[PDB]
Amino acid sequence: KVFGRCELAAAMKRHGLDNYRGYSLGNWVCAAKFESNFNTQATNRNTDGSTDYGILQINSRWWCNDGRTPGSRNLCNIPCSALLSSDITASVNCAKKIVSDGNGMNAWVAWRNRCKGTDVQAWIRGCR
Numbered sequence: 001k002v003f004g005r006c007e008l009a010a011a012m013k014r015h016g017l018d019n020y021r022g023y024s025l026g027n028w029v030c031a032a033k034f035e036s037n038f039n040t041q042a043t044n045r046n047t048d049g050s051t052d053y054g055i056l057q058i059n060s061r062w063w064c065n066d067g068r069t070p071g072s073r074n075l076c077n078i079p080c081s082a083l084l085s086s087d088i089t090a091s092v093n094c095a096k097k098i099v100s101d102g103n104g105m106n107a108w109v110a111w112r113n114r115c116k117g118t119d120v121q122a123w124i125r126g127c128r
Helices: 005-014 025-036 079-083 091-101 109-114 120-122
Strands: 043-045 051-053
Touching: 005 025, 005 120, 025 109, 051 079, 079 091, 091 120
Parallel strands: none
Antiparallel strands: 043 051
16 A cells, blocks of 8 residues: 555554654654655565565564564564565554664654754645
8 A cells, every 4th residue: 555645644643653652653654755755565585685565665574574574573574575565564663663772763763863963844835
């Protein structure tokens, strides 16, 4: 599913991401924009052999199981395929664990390089 911007904002808010670990909703929407272009089905292979999955590009080395990643820990106890669903619940629940792990949203490279320090509230402009 390719979410609309305000559609994704509303889903993320419903699931409690707005201000989670202190990160306002626009941070999460901006992260999803630049990690996946709002596409729940996005997958990208990494140099280390892991893959990033879903709307928030969750990594198969630490967080989800894809059956082909050396050193996998599956800390979010979930198949990586579950992070590609049109329902963002599993991605949200795993993102909550990731952002609590110590480095905050810096775990999302696209957030760090393209959202951090910017006017992120622009990402929820026009949204109810």
